[PDB]
Amino acid sequence: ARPKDRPSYCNLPADSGSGTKPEQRIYYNSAKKQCVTFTYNGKGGNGNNFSRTNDCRQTCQYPVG
Numbered sequence: 001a002r003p004k005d006r007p008s009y010c011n012l013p014a015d016s017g018s019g020t021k022p023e024q025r026i027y028y029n030s031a032k033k034q035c036v037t038f039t040y041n042g043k044g045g046n047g048n049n050f051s052r053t054n055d056c057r058q059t060c061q062y063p064v065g
Contacts, residue, residue: 007063009028012048013048014027016038016040016044016045017042020043022042023042024039025038025039025040025050028056035053035057
């Protein structure tokens, strides 16, 4: 039995921080209901990061209509 509540982590913010390892990373767009990349610097603030496009697919990339 495996449950999935609303996106939540999907809608979580791209937060880069003050940087340490600056990379492209990928997070679910809140408004746009997409999965886009964000600048992930690696510290400060939120860490909503999906590093695998397929992992965001799991989660949520495109809940469309």
